[PDB]
Structure formats: C-alpha cells, structure tokens
Tab-separated table of C-alpha atoms in Angstrom:
chain	number	residue	atom	x	y	z
I	1	UNK	CA	76.150	20.199	46.791
I	2	UNK	CA	79.809	20.945	46.188
I	3	UNK	CA	80.144	18.229	43.758
I	4	UNK	CA	79.333	20.596	40.884
I	5	UNK	CA	81.879	20.985	38.012
I	6	UNK	CA	84.895	19.110	39.107
I	7	UNK	CA	87.702	18.380	36.697
I	8	UNK	CA	88.392	14.931	35.380
I	9	UNK	CA	91.789	15.380	37.416
I	10	UNK	CA	90.025	16.027	40.758
I	11	UNK	CA	87.558	13.077	40.278
I	12	UNK	CA	90.560	10.873	39.530
I	13	UNK	CA	92.185	12.151	42.791
I	14	UNK	CA	88.992	11.308	44.641
I	15	UNK	CA	88.334	7.953	43.331
I	16	UNK	CA	91.969	6.684	43.983
I	17	UNK	CA	91.799	8.003	47.552
I	18	UNK	CA	90.939	4.746	49.187
I	19	UNK	CA	88.596	6.703	51.416
I	20	UNK	CA	84.977	5.256	50.589
I	21	UNK	CA	83.363	8.691	50.973
I	22	UNK	CA	85.792	10.781	49.059
I	23	UNK	CA	85.269	8.203	46.495
I	24	UNK	CA	81.579	8.723	46.614
I	25	UNK	CA	81.833	12.275	46.313
I	26	UNK	CA	84.104	11.970	43.326
I	27	UNK	CA	81.587	9.434	41.761
I	28	UNK	CA	78.798	11.900	42.277
I	29	UNK	CA	80.866	14.634	40.630
I	30	UNK	CA	81.453	12.250	37.603
I	31	UNK	CA	77.823	11.294	37.424
I	32	UNK	CA	76.976	15.245	37.154
I	33	UNK	CA	79.540	15.500	34.548
I	34	UNK	CA	78.164	12.888	32.549
I	35	UNK	CA	74.542	14.070	33.215
I	36	UNK	CA	74.960	17.279	31.159
I	37	UNK	CA	73.377	17.425	27.630
I	38	UNK	CA	76.076	19.646	26.460
I	39	UNK	CA	78.812	17.102	25.183
I	40	UNK	CA	79.211	15.024	28.336
I	41	UNK	CA	83.085	14.056	28.699
I	42	UNK	CA	82.477	10.338	28.230
I	43	UNK	CA	85.906	9.777	26.311
I	44	UNK	CA	87.676	11.731	28.986
I	45	UNK	CA	86.175	9.724	31.889
I	46	UNK	CA	87.016	6.535	29.935
I	47	UNK	CA	90.689	7.613	29.101
I	48	UNK	CA	91.084	8.196	32.820
I	49	UNK	CA	90.429	4.412	33.567
I	50	UNK	CA	87.424	5.057	35.862
I	51	UNK	CA	85.099	2.308	34.461
I	52	UNK	CA	86.754	-0.472	36.576
I	53	UNK	CA	86.299	1.601	39.618
I	54	UNK	CA	82.546	2.126	38.928
I	55	UNK	CA	82.222	-1.435	38.236
I	56	UNK	CA	83.658	-2.042	41.551
I	57	UNK	CA	81.485	0.386	43.221
I	58	UNK	CA	78.459	-1.472	41.874
I	59	UNK	CA	79.092	-4.271	44.333
I	60	UNK	CA	79.584	-2.314	47.473
I	61	UNK	CA	76.438	-3.299	49.448
I	62	UNK	CA	77.161	-1.257	52.505
I	63	UNK	CA	77.207	1.918	50.700
I	64	UNK	CA	74.091	2.002	48.433
I	65	UNK	CA	74.584	5.860	47.591
I	66	UNK	CA	77.987	4.895	45.643
I	67	UNK	CA	76.117	2.012	44.041
I	68	UNK	CA	73.503	4.356	42.676
I	69	UNK	CA	75.879	7.260	41.575
I	70	UNK	CA	78.100	4.731	39.776
I	71	UNK	CA	75.238	2.933	38.165
I	72	UNK	CA	74.127	6.337	36.863
I	73	UNK	CA	77.608	7.286	35.584
I	74	UNK	CA	78.042	3.948	33.820
I	75	UNK	CA	74.567	4.427	32.462
I	76	UNK	CA	75.585	7.644	30.678
I	77	UNK	CA	78.693	6.189	29.526
I	78	UNK	CA	76.739	3.343	27.952
I	79	UNK	CA	74.355	5.795	26.509
I	80	UNK	CA	76.986	7.041	23.893
I	81	UNK	CA	78.809	5.296	20.981
I	82	UNK	CA	79.098	1.397	20.425
I	83	UNK	CA	82.860	1.994	21.455
I	84	UNK	CA	81.895	3.759	24.701
I	85	UNK	CA	78.982	1.032	25.428
I	86	UNK	CA	81.879	-1.638	24.740
I	87	UNK	CA	84.183	0.099	27.193
I	88	UNK	CA	81.311	-0.177	29.764
I	89	UNK	CA	80.856	-3.770	29.007
I	90	UNK	CA	84.528	-4.876	29.110
I	91	UNK	CA	84.657	-3.618	32.643
I	92	UNK	CA	82.426	-6.393	33.892
I	93	UNK	CA	79.332	-4.339	34.142
I	94	UNK	CA	76.689	-6.634	32.837
I	95	UNK	CA	76.931	-9.165	35.864
I	96	UNK	CA	77.136	-6.292	38.341
I	97	UNK	CA	74.042	-4.560	37.050
I	98	UNK	CA	72.042	-7.977	37.069
I	99	UNK	CA	72.901	-8.409	40.566
I	100	UNK	CA	72.001	-4.948	41.340
I	101	UNK	CA	68.495	-5.733	39.755
I	102	UNK	CA	67.962	-7.498	43.172
I	103	UNK	CA	68.854	-4.427	45.192
I	104	UNK	CA	66.163	-3.710	47.943
I	105	UNK	CA	66.351	0.038	46.862
I	106	UNK	CA	64.045	0.780	43.988
I	107	UNK	CA	66.101	3.591	42.348
I	108	UNK	CA	69.266	1.542	42.335
I	109	UNK	CA	67.447	-1.370	40.601
I	110	UNK	CA	65.853	0.957	38.212
I	111	UNK	CA	69.248	2.523	37.317
I	112	UNK	CA	70.524	-1.174	36.790
I	113	UNK	CA	67.263	-1.682	34.577
I	114	UNK	CA	68.366	1.513	32.664
I	115	UNK	CA	72.134	0.658	32.199
I	116	UNK	CA	71.252	-2.946	31.054
I	117	UNK	CA	68.718	-1.450	28.422
I	118	UNK	CA	71.312	0.843	27.366
I	119	UNK	CA	73.680	-2.123	26.767
I	120	UNK	CA	71.330	-4.118	24.896
I	121	UNK	CA	70.446	-1.244	22.706
I	122	UNK	CA	73.637	-1.204	21.213
I	123	UNK	CA	72.799	-4.229	18.923
I	124	UNK	CA	72.318	-8.102	18.670
I	125	UNK	CA	75.657	-9.070	20.232
I	126	UNK	CA	75.331	-7.102	23.552
I	127	UNK	CA	71.635	-7.995	23.645
I	128	UNK	CA	72.150	-11.557	23.526
I	129	UNK	CA	75.222	-11.219	25.751
I	130	UNK	CA	72.979	-9.397	28.649
I	131	UNK	CA	70.631	-12.356	27.993
I	132	UNK	CA	73.277	-15.104	28.353
I	133	UNK	CA	74.339	-13.502	31.766
I	134	UNK	CA	70.646	-14.120	33.149
I	135	UNK	CA	68.968	-10.767	32.948
I	136	UNK	CA	65.510	-11.753	31.839
I	137	UNK	CA	64.766	-13.791	35.017
I	138	UNK	CA	65.228	-11.002	37.382
I	139	UNK	CA	63.856	-8.270	35.207
I	140	UNK	CA	60.525	-10.232	34.710
I	141	UNK	CA	60.559	-10.897	38.418
I	142	UNK	CA	60.532	-7.294	39.170
I	143	UNK	CA	57.236	-7.118	37.281
I	144	UNK	CA	55.620	-10.281	39.025
I	145	UNK	CA	53.049	-8.202	40.992
I	146	UNK	CA	49.094	-8.660	40.728
I	147	UNK	CA	48.606	-5.138	39.519
I	148	UNK	CA	51.282	-3.031	37.479
I	149	UNK	CA	49.507	0.115	38.942
I	150	UNK	CA	51.305	-0.504	42.101
I	151	UNK	CA	54.753	0.050	40.623
I	152	UNK	CA	56.229	3.403	40.186
I	153	UNK	CA	55.412	5.098	36.876
I	154	UNK	CA	59.128	5.718	35.730
I	155	UNK	CA	60.234	2.368	37.221
I	156	UNK	CA	57.601	0.700	35.014
I	157	UNK	CA	58.446	2.854	31.889
I	158	UNK	CA	62.088	1.897	32.203
I	159	UNK	CA	61.554	-1.703	32.633
I	160	UNK	CA	59.256	-1.574	29.557
I	161	UNK	CA	61.953	0.130	27.551
I	162	UNK	CA	64.716	-2.352	28.582
I	163	UNK	CA	62.401	-5.258	27.824
I	164	UNK	CA	61.643	-3.659	24.482
I	165	UNK	CA	65.436	-3.267	23.698
I	166	UNK	CA	65.882	-7.016	24.633
I	167	UNK	CA	63.427	-7.711	21.709
I	168	UNK	CA	65.101	-5.421	19.297
I	169	UNK	CA	67.510	-5.806	16.453
I	170	UNK	CA	67.779	-8.621	13.767
I	171	UNK	CA	70.516	-10.655	12.201
I	172	UNK	CA	70.326	-12.251	14.612
I	173	UNK	CA	67.103	-11.961	16.115
I	174	UNK	CA	66.466	-12.426	19.897
I	175	UNK	CA	66.649	-15.999	21.011
I	176	UNK	CA	63.292	-18.034	20.675
I	177	UNK	CA	63.471	-19.166	24.370
I	178	UNK	CA	63.908	-15.475	25.465
I	179	UNK	CA	61.088	-14.352	23.380
I	180	UNK	CA	58.857	-17.085	24.823
I	181	UNK	CA	59.885	-16.106	28.334
I	182	UNK	CA	59.192	-12.371	27.769
I	183	UNK	CA	56.079	-12.399	25.722
I	184	UNK	CA	53.478	-13.039	28.583
I	185	UNK	CA	54.736	-10.087	30.649
I	186	UNK	CA	55.123	-8.017	27.491
I	187	UNK	CA	51.503	-8.761	26.714
I	188	UNK	CA	50.374	-7.731	30.238
I	189	UNK	CA	52.312	-4.495	29.722
I	190	UNK	CA	50.464	-4.004	26.399
I	191	UNK	CA	47.340	-4.048	28.477
I	192	UNK	CA	48.462	-1.317	30.607
I	193	UNK	CA	46.927	2.190	31.013
I	194	UNK	CA	50.033	4.082	30.636
I	195	UNK	CA	50.770	5.699	27.099
I	196	UNK	CA	54.538	5.283	27.262
I	197	UNK	CA	54.389	1.786	28.717
I	198	UNK	CA	52.022	1.000	25.786
I	199	UNK	CA	54.116	2.777	22.955
I	200	UNK	CA	57.279	0.880	24.177
I	201	UNK	CA	55.149	-2.376	24.387
I	202	UNK	CA	54.022	-1.921	20.910
I	203	UNK	CA	57.424	-1.196	19.711
I	204	UNK	CA	58.614	-4.502	21.511
I	205	UNK	CA	55.768	-6.317	19.652
I	206	UNK	CA	56.801	-4.653	16.344
I	207	UNK	CA	60.302	-6.013	16.837
I	208	UNK	CA	59.202	-9.493	17.502
I	209	UNK	CA	56.715	-9.454	14.386
I	210	UNK	CA	59.433	-8.343	12.249
I	211	UNK	CA	60.798	-11.656	10.803
I	212	UNK	CA	59.762	-15.234	9.585
I	213	UNK	CA	56.282	-16.438	10.033
I	214	UNK	CA	57.236	-18.477	12.916
I	215	UNK	CA	57.921	-15.291	15.044
I	216	UNK	CA	54.662	-13.767	13.885
I	217	UNK	CA	53.084	-16.888	14.990
I	218	UNK	CA	54.530	-16.927	18.326
I	219	UNK	CA	53.098	-13.374	18.791
I	220	UNK	CA	49.777	-14.004	17.261
I	221	UNK	CA	49.251	-17.116	19.441
I	222	UNK	CA	49.189	-14.860	22.551
I	223	UNK	CA	46.002	-13.134	21.263
I	224	UNK	CA	47.558	-9.680	21.033
I	225	UNK	CA	46.052	-8.664	17.589
I	226	UNK	CA	42.825	-7.386	19.174
I	227	UNK	CA	44.596	-5.114	21.534
I	228	UNK	CA	46.977	-4.227	18.667
I	229	UNK	CA	43.893	-3.082	16.862
I	230	UNK	CA	42.435	-1.155	19.894
I	231	UNK	CA	45.696	0.740	20.191
I	232	UNK	CA	45.674	1.291	16.486
I	233	UNK	CA	42.553	3.399	17.085
I	234	UNK	CA	44.337	5.512	19.812
I	235	UNK	CA	44.668	9.053	19.596
I	236	UNK	CA	48.163	9.511	20.911
I	237	UNK	CA	50.327	9.036	17.762
I	238	UNK	CA	53.215	7.623	19.930
I	239	UNK	CA	51.018	4.649	20.531
I	240	UNK	CA	49.546	4.488	16.898
I	241	UNK	CA	52.944	4.407	15.064
I	242	UNK	CA	54.379	1.258	16.656
I	243	UNK	CA	50.801	-0.554	16.553
I	244	UNK	CA	50.473	0.253	12.798
I	245	UNK	CA	54.113	-1.028	12.321
I	246	UNK	CA	53.176	-4.228	14.256
I	247	UNK	CA	49.970	-4.793	12.209
I	248	UNK	CA	51.911	-4.209	9.133
I	249	UNK	CA	54.538	-6.791	10.042
I	250	UNK	CA	51.784	-9.248	11.025
I	251	UNK	CA	50.158	-8.906	7.675
I	252	UNK	CA	53.297	-10.053	5.938
I	253	UNK	CA	53.123	-13.604	7.286
I	254	UNK	CA	50.497	-16.255	6.239
I	255	UNK	CA	46.984	-15.495	4.871
I	256	UNK	CA	45.596	-16.897	8.263
I	257	UNK	CA	47.552	-14.434	10.251
I	258	UNK	CA	46.402	-11.699	7.889
I	259	UNK	CA	42.786	-13.027	8.476
I	260	UNK	CA	43.156	-12.921	12.233
I	261	UNK	CA	44.164	-9.182	11.761
I	262	UNK	CA	40.984	-8.701	9.732
I	263	UNK	CA	38.878	-10.422	12.154
I	264	UNK	CA	40.162	-8.276	15.024
I	265	UNK	CA	38.491	-5.428	12.931
I	266	UNK	CA	41.753	-3.536	11.916
I	267	UNK	CA	40.147	-2.407	8.490
I	268	UNK	CA	37.600	-0.496	10.255
I	269	UNK	CA	40.263	1.908	11.402
I	270	UNK	CA	42.065	2.288	8.160
I	271	UNK	CA	39.686	5.080	6.962
I	272	UNK	CA	41.389	7.311	9.380
I	273	UNK	CA	44.857	5.971	8.922
I	274	UNK	CA	44.751	6.303	5.292
I	275	UNK	CA	43.807	10.063	5.764
I	276	UNK	CA	46.150	10.593	8.549
I	277	UNK	CA	48.013	14.043	8.670
I	278	UNK	CA	51.305	12.158	9.501
I	279	UNK	CA	52.859	11.127	6.334
I	280	UNK	CA	54.403	8.050	7.851
I	281	UNK	CA	51.109	6.825	9.288
I	282	UNK	CA	49.517	7.209	5.778
I	283	UNK	CA	52.540	5.499	4.146
I	284	UNK	CA	52.642	2.336	6.645
I	285	UNK	CA	48.899	2.318	6.318
I	286	UNK	CA	49.059	2.007	2.650
I	287	UNK	CA	51.966	-0.527	2.967
I	288	UNK	CA	49.794	-2.758	5.238
I	289	UNK	CA	46.830	-2.348	2.672
I	290	UNK	CA	49.290	-3.739	0.001
I	291	UNK	CA	49.964	-6.811	2.083
I	292	UNK	CA	46.280	-7.439	2.331
I	293	UNK	CA	45.339	-7.047	-1.318
I	294	UNK	CA	47.973	-9.557	-1.927
I	295	UNK	CA	46.005	-12.254	0.042
I	296	UNK	CA	42.996	-14.272	-0.787
I	297	UNK	CA	40.017	-13.182	-2.669
I	298	UNK	CA	37.735	-13.212	0.147
I	299	UNK	CA	40.268	-10.818	2.082
I	300	UNK	CA	40.200	-8.409	-1.116
I	301	UNK	CA	36.345	-8.557	-0.732
I	302	UNK	CA	36.709	-7.699	3.045
I	303	UNK	CA	38.702	-4.905	1.885
I	304	UNK	CA	36.116	-3.790	-0.713
I	305	UNK	CA	33.266	-4.160	1.844
I	306	UNK	CA	35.049	-1.748	4.239
I	307	UNK	CA	34.947	0.819	1.630
I	308	UNK	CA	38.659	1.323	1.556
I	309	UNK	CA	39.113	1.205	-2.246
I	310	UNK	CA	37.938	4.835	-2.487
I	311	UNK	CA	40.646	5.647	0.158
I	312	UNK	CA	43.299	3.954	-1.926
I	313	UNK	CA	42.008	5.964	-4.765
I	314	UNK	CA	42.317	9.146	-2.743
I	315	UNK	CA	46.008	8.105	-1.511
I	316	UNK	CA	46.856	7.509	-5.248
I	317	UNK	CA	45.348	10.906	-6.272
I	318	UNK	CA	47.197	13.087	-3.601
I	319	UNK	CA	49.665	11.970	-1.155
I	320	UNK	CA	53.366	11.710	-0.339
I	321	UNK	CA	54.991	10.124	-3.387
I	322	UNK	CA	56.115	7.044	-1.203
I	323	UNK	CA	52.777	6.609	0.165
I	324	UNK	CA	51.536	6.786	-3.565
I	325	UNK	CA	54.077	4.061	-4.560
I	326	UNK	CA	52.739	1.760	-1.801
I	327	UNK	CA	49.346	2.492	-3.184
I	328	UNK	CA	50.341	1.612	-6.647
I	329	UNK	CA	51.759	-1.769	-5.075
I	330	UNK	CA	48.428	-2.368	-3.235
I	331	UNK	CA	46.446	-1.696	-6.631
I	332	UNK	CA	48.636	-4.127	-8.511
I	333	UNK	CA	48.322	-6.877	-5.783
I	334	UNK	CA	44.562	-6.289	-5.809
I	335	UNK	CA	44.322	-6.614	-9.557
I	336	UNK	CA	46.643	-9.591	-9.778
I	337	UNK	CA	44.955	-11.605	-7.146
I	338	UNK	CA	41.238	-10.297	-7.411
I	339	UNK	CA	38.348	-11.469	-9.417
I	340	UNK	CA	36.728	-9.642	-12.465
I	341	UNK	CA	33.944	-8.184	-10.161
I	342	UNK	CA	36.536	-6.668	-7.920
I	343	UNK	CA	38.737	-5.254	-10.683
I	344	UNK	CA	35.569	-3.711	-12.196
I	345	UNK	CA	34.733	-2.184	-9.084
I	346	UNK	CA	38.129	-0.744	-8.667
I	347	UNK	CA	37.833	0.867	-12.033
I	348	UNK	CA	34.389	2.191	-11.103
I	349	UNK	CA	35.816	3.929	-8.056
I	350	UNK	CA	37.981	5.998	-10.338
I	351	UNK	CA	41.394	4.481	-10.221
I	352	UNK	CA	42.338	4.943	-13.860
I	353	UNK	CA	43.010	8.819	-13.851
I	354	UNK	CA	45.217	8.871	-10.618
I	355	UNK	CA	46.997	5.647	-11.923
I	356	UNK	CA	47.770	7.311	-15.294
I	357	UNK	CA	48.937	10.596	-13.458
I	358	UNK	CA	51.695	8.475	-11.875
I	359	UNK	CA	53.215	7.425	-15.236
I	360	UNK	CA	55.081	10.697	-15.381
I	361	UNK	CA	57.120	10.066	-12.113
I	362	UNK	CA	61.031	9.550	-12.437
I	363	UNK	CA	60.850	6.293	-10.401
I	364	UNK	CA	61.352	3.343	-12.682
I	365	UNK	CA	59.805	0.931	-10.243
I	366	UNK	CA	56.589	2.652	-9.920
I	367	UNK	CA	56.229	2.756	-13.628
I	368	UNK	CA	56.701	-1.154	-13.792
I	369	UNK	CA	54.127	-1.655	-10.903
I	370	UNK	CA	51.470	0.846	-12.588
I	371	UNK	CA	51.860	-1.020	-15.970
I	372	UNK	CA	51.459	-4.559	-14.413
I	373	UNK	CA	48.257	-3.275	-12.821
I	374	UNK	CA	47.164	-1.932	-16.230
I	375	UNK	CA	47.893	-5.317	-17.833
I	376	UNK	CA	45.859	-7.040	-15.007
I	377	UNK	CA	42.836	-4.710	-15.516
I	378	UNK	CA	42.973	-5.022	-19.320
I	379	UNK	CA	42.946	-8.790	-18.829
I	380	UNK	CA	40.005	-8.622	-16.624
I	381	UNK	CA	38.290	-6.329	-19.281
I	382	UNK	CA	39.180	-8.932	-22.218
I	383	UNK	CA	37.321	-11.438	-19.968
I	384	UNK	CA	34.218	-9.162	-20.740
I	385	UNK	CA	34.741	-7.926	-24.273
I	386	UNK	CA	35.462	-4.500	-22.754
I	387	UNK	CA	38.879	-3.599	-23.876
I	388	UNK	CA	37.496	-0.989	-26.273
I	389	UNK	CA	35.804	0.751	-23.262
I	390	UNK	CA	38.868	0.664	-21.023
I	391	UNK	CA	41.182	1.963	-24.034
I	392	UNK	CA	38.741	4.733	-24.528
I	393	UNK	CA	38.964	5.564	-20.865
I	394	UNK	CA	42.630	5.594	-20.700
I	395	UNK	CA	42.754	7.704	-23.794
I	396	UNK	CA	40.409	10.330	-22.870
I	397	UNK	CA	42.380	11.055	-19.455
I	398	UNK	CA	45.698	11.502	-21.165
I	399	UNK	CA	47.038	7.900	-20.361
I	400	UNK	CA	47.643	6.757	-24.095
I	401	UNK	CA	50.163	9.767	-24.406
I	402	UNK	CA	52.176	8.642	-21.403
I	403	UNK	CA	52.046	5.122	-22.293
I	404	UNK	CA	53.640	5.827	-25.704
I	405	UNK	CA	56.199	8.234	-24.297
I	406	UNK	CA	57.281	5.171	-22.074
I	407	UNK	CA	58.510	3.250	-25.194
I	408	UNK	CA	61.533	5.443	-25.212
I	409	UNK	CA	62.311	5.144	-21.522
I	410	UNK	CA	65.586	3.743	-20.799
I	411	UNK	CA	64.784	0.810	-18.771
I	412	UNK	CA	64.071	-2.566	-20.651
I	413	UNK	CA	61.113	-4.145	-19.183
I	414	UNK	CA	59.400	-0.640	-18.822
I	415	UNK	CA	59.457	-0.167	-22.642
I	416	UNK	CA	58.801	-3.893	-23.451
I	417	UNK	CA	55.508	-3.798	-21.408
I	418	UNK	CA	54.537	-0.423	-22.752
I	419	UNK	CA	55.126	-1.350	-26.487
I	420	UNK	CA	53.164	-4.661	-25.664
I	421	UNK	CA	50.312	-2.598	-24.176
I	422	UNK	CA	50.417	-0.147	-27.303
I	423	UNK	CA	50.486	-2.919	-29.791
I	424	UNK	CA	47.891	-4.990	-28.164
I	425	UNK	CA	45.021	-2.747	-26.937
I	426	UNK	CA	45.427	0.466	-29.170
I	427	UNK	CA	45.485	-0.268	-32.953
G	1	UNK	CA	68.661	2.726	20.918
G	2	UNK	CA	70.016	4.370	24.124
G	3	UNK	CA	68.877	6.988	26.618
G	4	UNK	CA	71.031	9.298	28.732
G	5	UNK	CA	70.007	10.147	32.063
G	6	UNK	CA	69.728	13.956	32.688
G	7	UNK	CA	69.590	15.766	36.065
C-alpha cells in the first residue's frame, strides 16, 4: 500500500487527474490521512476543495472502491466541528449517501449509514434535513429481516447508532411521524442480545422520552417499559445508564405512566441503583425517586412497601452532594404529597439527623427544600399533637442550632421560613 | 454526537 502519507498537494494532483484510478488512489490516501487520530487534516482537505469531488465519487456505480473510500473520507470530515459537517452537507452529500444506502455492497451501505449518523448528530437542523431527504425508509429497510442476528455485528451497531442520532436533540424534537416510523424497529433492537445495540437503543428511547407527556406516551404505548426495567437490572453499566435515564424521563410524565413503570417492577431494582458505585447512577436513581414520591399516595406507599425509604435515608446520610440534593427533593415531595402515617414512617426510618446535617451546606436551594420538608413533617405532627416530640428530636441532634443560624442567611425566603419555624415550634 | 472511523 503506497497510499500512506501523501501531501494534500499530491492528493489534489491525483483527484484532478481525470483518471478514475489515479483518483481512487488519491481518495484512498485522503481517507488514510483523515483516519489518523492525531489531528486529521480536515480543514486542509476542505480548503483544497475536495468535498465536491468526493460527493461526485459517491455516485460512481461502476467503481465501488472509490465509493467506499470517498464515503469513509466524508464520514471523517463530517465527524468534526459543525462547520466541517456543514461543509460536507453543502457539497450535496446527504442525497448521495441516501442513494448509497441501497448499495449491494454491505460495507458501502454501512459507511453511508455512518456518514448519515455523523451528519444527523450535528444537531436538530441537519437531523431533520436528513429525515426530509428520505433516509428513514431505506435505513429501516436495511433492518427488515426476520432475525436481527443474521446481520453483521458492526453493521447492526452502526445502524442502531445512526437511528439513535435521528431520535436525538430537542428544540426542535424529531418529527412525530418520524418517531412513529422508527419506534417499532427501535423496540425490536431494544430486544436484541448485543450490549452495544442495547445501549444505543436505550439512549434513543431516552431521547424520545425527554419531552412532553405526548412523547412519553408514544413510547410507553409500545410496551417497552418492562424491557427498560429488565435492562435497568443489567450488569453492563453502559446499558444501565441509558435505561435509568429513560425510566427517569418516563416518571416525569403523568401518574399513569409512573404507575406503568412501577407495575413493571422498577422499584425492585432501586436498592442496587441507590447504592451503585457510580455517582451518576446514584444521582439519577435518586432523581427518579423524587419524581415518584411526587406522585399519588398509593405510589408513595409502593415506594415504602419496597423498603426504599431506608435507602433514601442512606443517600441523604452519605453520598455525592448532588445525589443528596436530589434526595432532599424526593423527601420534600414525599412529605408534601404523603399521608400522616407515611410521614411518621419516614421520621421513624431516621430522616431527621441526615436532614439536619444538610442545613450547613452552601447551596441556598437545598436549604429551602429541607425547610419545606421540615414544615410538612411538622404539619403532620401537629395533626397528632406531637410537635413537642419532633421539636425535642430536632433539638437533640443539633438541628435547632442550624435553624436559628439560618435566620441571618442572606436569602429572603430562607430566613423567612427559618424564623417562622423558630417562632412556631420553639418557644 | 459524532464518531470518526479509524484504520
């Protein structure tokens, strides 16, 4: 292979030669230049004006090697900044790649899938432009096989990643018709036995579930929540992270969607998620819990039945401070929407000491959340003639001191609520 | 977002 380490000048000489095979050699040399991880000369290749020549090569049926080489080079040009991807798009590459998707050579169609994914990954605009050119139909036609296992592993992984990029990005979100067109194949991929396919499919579902309740409902109608929970229980963290993200997105919708999550058995997995060694898994699991303790009282009772209140107490006691803030949110929602029996159970699980210990943080929001939770618990106690007991409890663990110190805190509502508590339950 | 193809 004497196509190693050409100069941009030599490649330009070869591509302008009007000799199909000299052009093929120059295009392979360009591909190898662009395939180096140490600063590929993308900008230099663009300034040479080579993108139109590559795009024209994309359509040379009688020379599949130059098709593959130009597709690879343009894929690696589109893998760069938004301006480089834009240079690829302006050359007319989208329709050429969509036409290549029907190539009878598997590696060329795979490279076209790769390039289209790189393009759509730039953002909403290029995503929707790829959709408008009619990519979804051929992309999904490539997956129209009885058993996904017959497809090549890398082929299927690239197809899944591209389809996931077609579901990515918001403001705007993907077209509803496109999501309806993709979701069946996406579910079939979500039921695949390959870990990377599963991770990309869960990321796609997490993208689709990040939005209004209508999108969440589109996703939930397809009965993917049970599979999402099964994957939530997986050992491969790359699969668990997107599955937890998707469950947390779904529980932000209506209480019926949250209830479908609960029915699928998600809570049973949360004892592990809330003690996960990954800080972000813990944080997102606590964030998901906060969106469940905000729901109905029967759902709070489901949380309690699964014995997850001790795990929230633990997270509040020792965890990354952001996880602790999400836990404070969950506790405040619990107390605001829960019964008196449930608030009493929360206090019995040992919430008061770790809740007080967080009133010395420098985050003003967590102070407000904790004070709101304390006010709710004190209301629940008033409903029992137990305010004296709870005040004694908060005093014996050093909480009264922090509450008093919060009267000089700069923020307004902070000292307002703290002074209210001081004057109302401590006299 | 994007993925470069390496040799």
